[PDB]
Amino acid sequence: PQITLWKRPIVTIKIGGQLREALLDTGADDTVLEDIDLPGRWKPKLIVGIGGFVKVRQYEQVPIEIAGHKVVGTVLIGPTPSNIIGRNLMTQLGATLNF
Amino acid sequence: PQITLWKRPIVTIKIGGQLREALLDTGADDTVLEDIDLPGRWKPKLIVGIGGFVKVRQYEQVPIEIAGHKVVGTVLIGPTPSNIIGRNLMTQLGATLNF
Numbered sequence: 178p179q180i181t182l183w184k185r186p187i188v189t190i191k192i193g194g195q196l197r198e199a200l201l202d203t204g205a206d207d208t209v210l211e212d213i214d215l216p217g218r219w220k221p222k223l224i225v226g227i228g229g230f231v232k233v234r235q236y237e238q239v240p241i242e243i244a245g246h247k248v249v250g251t252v253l254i255g256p257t258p259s260n261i262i263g264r265n266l267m268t269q270l271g272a273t274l275n276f
Numbered sequence: 277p278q279i280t281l282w283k284r285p286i287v288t289i290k291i292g293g294q295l296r297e298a299l300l301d302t303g304a305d306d307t308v309l310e311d312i313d314l315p316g317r318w319k320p321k322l323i324v325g326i327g328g329f330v331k332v333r334q335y336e337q338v339p340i341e342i343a344g345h346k347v348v349g350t351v352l353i354g355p356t357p358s359n360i361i362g363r364n365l366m367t368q369l370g371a372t373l374n375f
């Protein structure tokens with residue numbers, strides 16, 4: 178799909194059998210989700226945003242569906258005001274910005 | 277132009293006669309720049325990112341050139357780890373996400 182930016186670019190995701198919404202975020206290198214259970218091992222990671230840092234769990238090779246597209250990639254789980262899909266997963270969709 | 281997302285989507289801006297780089301940031305409602313002098317009156321504003329909040333200066337009806345395109349809009353000045361162009365200005369470029 179093509180979307181304009183008058184509204185927040187929010188898409189449906191399915192991850193670990195959980196349905197959520199998340200923002201397609203070209204300003205995010207990595208994908209950060211708050212509200213999710215993932216199985217198995219993870220690595221501590223500190224990430225830096227506007228207004229400081231948060232501690233997240235890095236989960237690797239997580240299967241995730243973004244607006245119908247199945248991809249596998251790194252997901253960070255931790256406090257974020259908004260679930261965000263980063264460039265790590267949007268590149269797997271072949272996503273582009275046009276102006 | 278069209279750009280892919282394997283790299284950060286960085287563009288050149290000109291604002292208040294000052295040249296800078298900034299991220300085209302679909303996850304940002306508003307535009308936030310750190311390294312800038314703007315003339316005249318402004319309003320206190322608190323904005324929330326990953327890792328918390330920052331106090332910014334809201335400047336209204338600021339002229340800004342983004343990859344060649346002259347627009348006028350609201351600019352927030354304050355601490356951000358990366359200059360970000362938000363949807364408030366990307367809608368003026370007719371920017372779209374495609375996948």
Ligand SMILES: CC(C)CN(C[C@@H](O)[C@H](Cc1cc(F)cc(F)c1)NC(=O)O[C@H]1[C@H]2CO[C@H]3OC[C@@H]1[C@H]3C2)S(=O)(=O)c1ccc2nc(NC3CC3)sc2c1
Nearest residue numbers: 204205206207226227258259303304305306323325326358
């Ligand atoms: C600031 C950017 C440069 C980085 N961020 C992405 C932005 O898109 C956020 C998204 C977001 C939207 C929200 F709704 C709420 C939020 F908390 C966050 N936008 C934002 O904060 O916008 C602000 C301001 C703009 O206007 C308004 O709109 C919303 C608010 C408000 C004020 S990030 O989240 O810090 C980020 C993400 C992944 C990541 N991966 C990394 N990789 C590792 C280092 C190797 S570093 C890294 C950093």
Ligand SMILES: [Cl-]
Nearest residue numbers: 280281282283
């Ligand atoms: Cl690129």
